[PDB]
Structure 1
């Protein structure tokens, strides 16, 4: 679901990329894949919004956005719709340079 935050179940990558956010429109939920953006712990502001949530303090790595099989979206933990503006702005910057 769009803006839902999912836990990364891959132990090899979960440390650096603990979560990823679904950024794909729900109108396309028929697809077997989802466009997602990984979050990385804090430890280019317009491109990589800062995300302070209950899970911790992260940066959304918009440029590392990727398509993943829908099956790995098995563990939703949060929902980031209050960040919609920042997320869309970052993607627009990455693609349209706005």
Structure 2
């Protein structure tokens, strides 16, 4: 669901990418894939700033790695934990930065 934060259930990738955010429109939720963006802990790191928004939340301080955006099977969204709706503008702007350079 759009802007919902999900726990990464893969033990292999959980250390550098604890969480990911769903950025796909809810109007397309019959697709069996989801476009998501990984979050990486700031401690495991400066980031390009306009590309990689800094996320201050209850789970901690993260950098959203927009450039590692990728589509995944919907099945890996089994564990929702939070939501990032108040970051909507920052997220959409970062995505625009990656694609339009605007």
Question: How many residues end up aligned between the 2 structures?
Answer: 98
CA–CA separation in structure 1 for the residues paired with 2:88 and 2:66: 13
SS at match of 1:90: helix
SS at match of 1:12: coil
Normalising by the residue count of structure 1, what TM-score does the alignment of the two structures yield? 0.99
Give per-residue Cα distances to partners, 1:44-90, cap 9 Å, x unaligned: 10000000000010000000000000000000000000000000000
- Which ranges in structure 1 are unaligned for 5 or more consecutive residues? none
- Deviant stretches of 4+, over 3 Å: none
- Which ranges in structure 2 are unaligned for 5 or more consecutive residues? none
CA RMSD of superposed structures (Å): 0.3
Mapping of residues 29-44 of structure 1, within 5 Å: 29-43=29-43, 44=48
Normalising by the residue count of structure 2, what TM-score does the alignment of the two structures yield? 0.95
CA–CA separation in structure 2 for the residues paired with 1:93 and 1:51: 17
SS at match of 2:12: helix
CA–CA separation in structure 2 for the residues paired with 1:65 and 1:46: 15
